[PDB]
């Protein structure tokens, strides 16, 4: 009967849909590789989808995926075993080298831009009319690391203009230089800013930005990767 026809036809549709979904989710990361970077023999059951091209706003060009994949950075790791499937140990300082949970990706070294072509993120001192509207204003508070030592003070908030949100805290260190801290990795208290991920001695190693009034996508990745890496690697120095 008709209901039978409907259910069988629906399952065929579903199998096609799942095939489509699976292949769409292979647009990044494939082809698969062996641990040495050569192409793996087994690429799985689905073939790579035909390339699609995105036209980027503001004359930033195009992106075609899937396309030639390359880390575009040195990876300081070494095998710990003679067969496939074991962890790869850092050969230097995993925080400095950017591996493990401290990893960063080689995104473009340009700032993200808003719908008008202006920098999306800016220090609040340069963002006209922006101010703290609710909660504790962190500007002027001391910044404490997981070793419970003071590492610096907040001197500004970096804000997302189009989305009206606080994205980073600019923190001044003892030598007078500053660094950015991701807002999602700090705890604003009444008399301080607490940073669980890093001990005081690691604040100076946070990657610096090249221009004082803008952050690039590459810089944000290095900074955020570094900070999150302290959860695993600062550990010896964390106390509570």
């Amino acid at each position: 009967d008709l209901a039978s026809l409907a259910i069988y036809s629906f399952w065929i549709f579903l199998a096609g849909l799942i095939y489509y979904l699976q292949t769409e989710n292979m647009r990044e990361g494939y082809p698969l590789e062996n641990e040495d970077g050569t192409p793996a023999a087994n690429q799985g059951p689905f073939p790579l989808p035909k390339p699609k091209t995105f036209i980027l706003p503001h004359g930033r060009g195009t992106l075609t995926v899937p396309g030639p994949e390359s880390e575009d950075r040195p990876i300081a790791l070494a095998r710990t075993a003679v067969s496939e499937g074991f962890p790869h140990a850092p050969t230097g300082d995993p925080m400095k080298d950017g591996v493990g949970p401290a990893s960063w990706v080689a995104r473009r070294d340009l700032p993200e831009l808003d719908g008008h072509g202006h920098n999306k993120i800016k220090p609040m001192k340069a963002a006209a009319g922006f101010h703290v509207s609710a909660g504790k204003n962190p500007i002027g508070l001391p910044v404490r690391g997981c070793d419970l030592e003071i590492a610096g003070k907040v001197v500004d908030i970096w804000v997302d203009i189009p989305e009206q949100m606080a994205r980073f805290l600019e923190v001044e260190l003892k030598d007078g230089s500053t660094r950015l801290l991701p807002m999602q990795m700090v705890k604003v208290q009444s008399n301080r800013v607490h940073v669980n991920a890093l001990s005081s001695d690691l604040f100076a190693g946070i990657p610096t930005i090249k221009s004082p009034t803008e952050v690039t996508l590459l810089e944000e990745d290095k900074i955020c990767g570094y900070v999150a890496g302290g959860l695993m690697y600062a550990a010896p120095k964390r106390k509570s």
Binding site: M26, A128, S133, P182, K187, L217, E220
Partner: protein, 302 residues
Amino acid sequence: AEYQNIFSQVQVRGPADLGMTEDVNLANRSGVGPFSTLLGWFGNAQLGPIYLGSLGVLSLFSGLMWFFTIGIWFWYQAGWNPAVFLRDLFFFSLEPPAPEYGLSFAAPLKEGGLWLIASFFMFVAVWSWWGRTYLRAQALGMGKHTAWAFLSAIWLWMVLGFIRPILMGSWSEAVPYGIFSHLDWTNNFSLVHGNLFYNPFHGLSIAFLYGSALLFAMHGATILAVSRFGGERELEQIADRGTAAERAALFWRWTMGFNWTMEGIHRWAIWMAVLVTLTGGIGILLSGTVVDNWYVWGQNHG
């Protein structure tokens, strides 16, 4: 403990954002509304502006009329008394015409004519709203995903109040406008068709409804977990993959071998949800028209 990013710790505000222009007719936008600090702890603080336009006005007027028509009936069933109106609010019901009147528009008002009027207004309100969802995207040069997804919900609503009733030969088959009465109707529908747990489309619809909660829980949680790397800036992660997108992909890969991209997970999202009402609409449509009793049908499969 660590900050979890469920509520914002600090709010920041700047000048009211008037939004992108593209091909929008700015004469039809309202001014900006107030800023809500309450809302700003969880999402955006800004209220408005809103776009009006012809379709918007038509949809809002029709919509209010549908609502008021039902409200008038409730007041009448309450004998115009405010204490009875409140006490029995959930029990009132505006019912479709009796089976005797078939598909005709003759039915007297207290006997279904008022149901037909309210339904007319609802029909216009929803379809004009649909046109609005298509045009608001077109004016901004966006894809029409929103309008097409909305059509899946409209499909179930149309089957329930319009298509099934027409194919059955009577308006009496449609859903009544009432809180408890539409629940009673739902229960009765399953009893009358031999238990909807045996309708395969109903079972599929449930799998997508549950799967929608599973997926939003996964997706919502994943983006929050990688928000420390700017993960919710999904569009730029799609254009220029960052460590947020890599870590999210790896979480799902290492956990269950699933292929994941930042754009791709949104395709899963749209389809999981849309399939809820797509499959459901088919299941209801076939009930009574083609299949009188799902248990019987299941015993045979035809």
